[PDB]
Enzyme design. Structure first.
Site, PDB file in Angstrom:
ATOM      1  N   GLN A 149       1.042  -0.823   0.135  1.00 46.54           N
ATOM      2  CA  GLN A 149       0.300   0.338  -0.343  1.00 46.54           C
ATOM      3  C   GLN A 149       1.046   1.464   0.115  1.00 46.54           C
ATOM      4  O   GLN A 149       0.291   2.102  -0.617  1.00 46.54           O
ATOM      5  CB  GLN A 149      -0.943  -0.315   1.291  1.00 46.54           C
ATOM      6  CG  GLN A 149      -1.660   1.161   1.698  1.00 46.54           C
ATOM      7  CD  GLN A 149      -2.099   1.930   0.262  1.00 46.54           C
ATOM      8  OE1 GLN A 149      -2.650   3.191  -0.186  1.00 46.54           O
ATOM      9  NE2 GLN A 149      -3.489   0.895  -0.400  1.00 46.54           N
ATOM     10  N   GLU A 150       1.838   1.115   0.639  1.00 46.12           N
ATOM     11  CA  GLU A 150       2.831   2.463   1.113  1.00 46.12           C
ATOM     12  C   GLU A 150       4.031   2.792  -0.328  1.00 46.12           C
ATOM     13  O   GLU A 150       3.720   3.703  -0.372  1.00 46.12           O
ATOM     14  CB  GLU A 150       3.241   2.193   2.361  1.00 46.12           C
ATOM     15  CG  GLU A 150       3.175   2.144   3.866  1.00 46.12           C
ATOM     16  CD  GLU A 150       1.874   3.964   3.808  1.00 46.12           C
ATOM     17  OE1 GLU A 150       1.334   3.643   4.847  1.00 46.12           O
ATOM     18  OE2 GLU A 150       2.393   4.352   3.022  1.00 46.12           O
ATOM     19  N   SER A 151       4.286   2.158  -0.804  1.00 47.76           N
ATOM     20  CA  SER A 151       5.183   2.239  -2.007  1.00 47.76           C
ATOM     21  C   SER A 151       4.367   0.735  -3.144  1.00 47.76           C
ATOM     22  O   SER A 151       5.645   1.295  -4.669  1.00 47.76           O
ATOM     23  CB  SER A 151       6.512   1.801  -1.563  1.00 47.76           C
ATOM     24  OG  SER A 151       6.328   0.664  -1.579  1.00 47.76           O
ATOM     25  N   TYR A 168      -8.045   2.833   2.562  1.00 40.84           N
ATOM     26  CA  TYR A 168      -5.986   2.357   2.937  1.00 40.84           C
ATOM     27  C   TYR A 168      -5.975   1.263   4.063  1.00 40.84           C
ATOM     28  O   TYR A 168      -5.895  -0.098   3.427  1.00 40.84           O
ATOM     29  CB  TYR A 168      -5.375   3.565   4.053  1.00 40.84           C
ATOM     30  CG  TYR A 168      -4.081   3.021   4.463  1.00 40.84           C
ATOM     31  CD1 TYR A 168      -4.418   2.344   5.338  1.00 40.84           C
ATOM     32  CD2 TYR A 168      -2.789   4.156   3.761  1.00 40.84           C
ATOM     33  CE1 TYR A 168      -2.691   1.997   5.779  1.00 40.84           C
ATOM     34  CE2 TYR A 168      -1.386   3.035   4.529  1.00 40.84           C
ATOM     35  CZ  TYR A 168      -1.712   2.774   5.690  1.00 40.84           C
ATOM     36  OH  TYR A 168      -0.197   2.172   5.456  1.00 40.84           O
TER      37      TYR A 168
END
Length: 613
Positions: free
Chosen positions: A474-476, A582
């Site tokens: 999710q983040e990168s 998210y």
């Protein structure tokens, strides 16, 4: 031939010397990056270049990612010269350069298109931010032809006040012939709307005062919806609000109250959107009923949704689930859930969990026509991106890749996804396959890079290792050099102050902020920090995931006065759209990574299904 005329000519071109490039134009007409040197050389002497040469370059190299900057600069020259025939041949509204739109309005005013030029002026005028210089010229022409009424100044003032551009708004206020007082009042109220508490001062029964008050109540609703509602209740009968501004006020107050779980939102929202025209209000009306445990009403509302909301997996899920909660012994929710099991997203997992059936986890690479694959690898953008990549110019390669994707069709997007995956370019691949809406390829959608360190640090910190893969995905999207606009860096998007504190807390060495793009350093600090958020919320991944994205304080606020709240209601009623998605992403990704790690992960764990304040 390993043609190296290109780096020579690049050096000379950057900067000053165009002689080597011109000497190589024939010897490099096949090298894919050659249009970039041509582009720089033409741009440097653009004020001297013939129409013929520029038109030829735009004719044959319209696919360069940066070609819009060349058109902006050239069209500016053409307009400054009165070359209006060439300007309109090449003016593209879809460039989204306000400056060209304003030059185009000027063209319309001076070439017998006054009605359309007035409409262009007004559209560019009714904007809450300062516009470019060419628009000032257009507005000047438009004002010169008697079109800039006080009412249009007033409208723009309101827009400027809404966008918090008060210098603009105050300048517009100084240009009002009769409304300068109310205009200053608009600015003051926009800056501090709590002054509307002085009801005695905002009593004059004119539309200007109603506009001032309505703007202030909409602003005030963002941070104090209860005070805004009381003041609406006073002002509604005192000021001549139009039917439209009253609906806008009510909907903004209703939405902000509902995000605080205040049941006063429901009568207001029900009265001001009886026909469910505003999807945001419909969803928050339903979310609020779910937060309040009003299953009967939530179910009845899911039955009346407009087609675009009814078709989503979200409201198909909540129709089945509110029915099951309203009638725990009814068999009817079974068939409703079964329509949804088969969907590959968060709400499909929830439906399968409610049925207690296995998840749908098919990992199916798309079959690609070799001719479409060849087409995509043959495209000039692709070859340019390939060569950029091999030479290490990674930002240029990505820009080619992303610009090219803006025109590819579904099959081509899928082929591009495969090509980028084979280059270890996980995010470009994820981006393409997502545009193509081809969800069954779980190798591309869920990379496993740095697996050994991810599993080890998850083990060291006592975390489900699927969770850390999920957070990373999710983040990168597994781009270890990713960096956000506010400074978050690396696989796990750590803020540098966060990383240094984690480093001191655990005794994990961190030489500098810069080391955060080294994958193993990122994962070690990210896993440690993630485990802190995890134990701060009693090992609950739903809450900890939300806190990773929104902060621990916001999450504690979203837990106030809860008791035996079900996890799916809590997620659904998260106030921030970003944080809700998210969390749903991370939980869904952890399921997938659980399969890939041979460590099955249900969508939520037993200990996560309920939680209290």
């Amino acid at each position: 031939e390993q043609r190296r005329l290109y780096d020579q000519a690049k050096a000379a071109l950057a900067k000053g010397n165009s002689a080597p490039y011109m000497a190589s134009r024939s010897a490099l007409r096949d090298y894919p990056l050659e249009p970039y040197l041509a582009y720089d050389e033409l741009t440097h002497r653009l004020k001297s270049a013939s129409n013929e040469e520029v038109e030829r370059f735009l004719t044959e190299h319209g696919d360069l990612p940066q070609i819009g900057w060349l058109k902006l600069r050239w069209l500016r020259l053409l307009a400054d010269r009165g070359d209006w025939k060439t300007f309109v041949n090449y003016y593209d509204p879809k460039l989204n350069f306000t400056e060209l739109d304003c030059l185009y309005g000027q063209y319309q005013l001076g070439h017998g298109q006054k009605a359309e030029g007035y409409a262009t002026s007004e559209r560019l005028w009714l904007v809450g931010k300062s516009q470019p210089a060419a628009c000032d010229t257009l507005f000047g022409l438009w004002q010169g032809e008697g079109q800039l009424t006080e009412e249009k100044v007033w409208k723009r003032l309101k827009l400027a006040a809404e966008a918090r551009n008060y210098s603009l708004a105050s300048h517009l206020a100084q240009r009002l012939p009769t409304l300068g007082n109310q205009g200053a009042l608009m600015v003051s109220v926009a800056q501090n709307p709590a002054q509307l508490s002085q009801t005695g001062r905002f009593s004059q029964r004119d539309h200007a005062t109603a506009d001032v008050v309505g703007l202030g109540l909409r602003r005030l609703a963002r941070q104090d919806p209860e005070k805004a509602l009381s003041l609406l209740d006073y002002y509604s009968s005192a000021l001549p609000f139009s039917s439209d501004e009253k609906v806008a006020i009510a909907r903004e107050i209703g939405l902000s109250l509902a995000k605080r779980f205040d049941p006063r939102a429901l009568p207001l929202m029900t009265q001001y959107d009886p026909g469910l025209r505003d999807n945001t209000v419909t969803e928050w009306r339903t979310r609020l009923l779910l937060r309040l445990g009003r299953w009967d009403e939530a179910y009845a509302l899911t039955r009346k949704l407009p087609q675009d909301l009814a078709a989503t997996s979200r409201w198909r899920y909540w129709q089945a689930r509110s029915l099951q909660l309203a009638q725990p012994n009814s068999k009817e929710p079974i068939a409703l859930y079964q329509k949804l099991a088969g969907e590959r997203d968060f709400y499909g997992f929830l439906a399968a969990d409610r049925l207690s059936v296995p998840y749908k986890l098919g990992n199916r690479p798309a079959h690609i026509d070799p001719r479409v694959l060849q087409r995509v690898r043959n495209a000039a953008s692709t070859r340019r991106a390939m060569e950029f990549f091999n030479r290490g110019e990674v930002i240029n390669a990505r820009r080619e890749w992303y610009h090219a994707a803006r025109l590819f069709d579904r099959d081509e997007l899928i082929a591009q996804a495969r090509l980028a995956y084979d280059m270890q370019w996980y995010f470009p691949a994820i981006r393409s396959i997502s545009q193509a809406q081809y969800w069954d390829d779980l190798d591309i959608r869920f990379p496993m890079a740095h697996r050994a360190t991810l599993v080890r640090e998850a083990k060291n910190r006592g975390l489900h290792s699927s969770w850390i893969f999920a957070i990373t995905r999710q983040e990168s999207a597994f781009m270890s050099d990713a960096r956000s606009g506010v400074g978050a860096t690396g696989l796990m998007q750590l803020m540098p102050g966060t990383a240094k504190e984690t480093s001191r807390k655990f005794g994990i060495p961190l030489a500098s902020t810069q080391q955060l793009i080294v994958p193993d350093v990122n994962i070690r600090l990210g896993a440690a920090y993630l485990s802190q958020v995890h134990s701060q919320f009693n090992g609950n991944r739903v809450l900890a995931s939300a806190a990773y994205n929104a902060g621990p304080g916001r999450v504690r606020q979203w837990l106030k006065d809860t008791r035996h709240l079900a996890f799916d209601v809590w997620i659904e009623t998260i106030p921030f759209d970003e944080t809700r998605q998210y969390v749903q992403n991370v939980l869904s990704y952890a399921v997938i990574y659980g399969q890939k790690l041979n460590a099955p992960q249900p969508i939520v764990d037993w200990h996560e299904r309920y939680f209290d304040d």
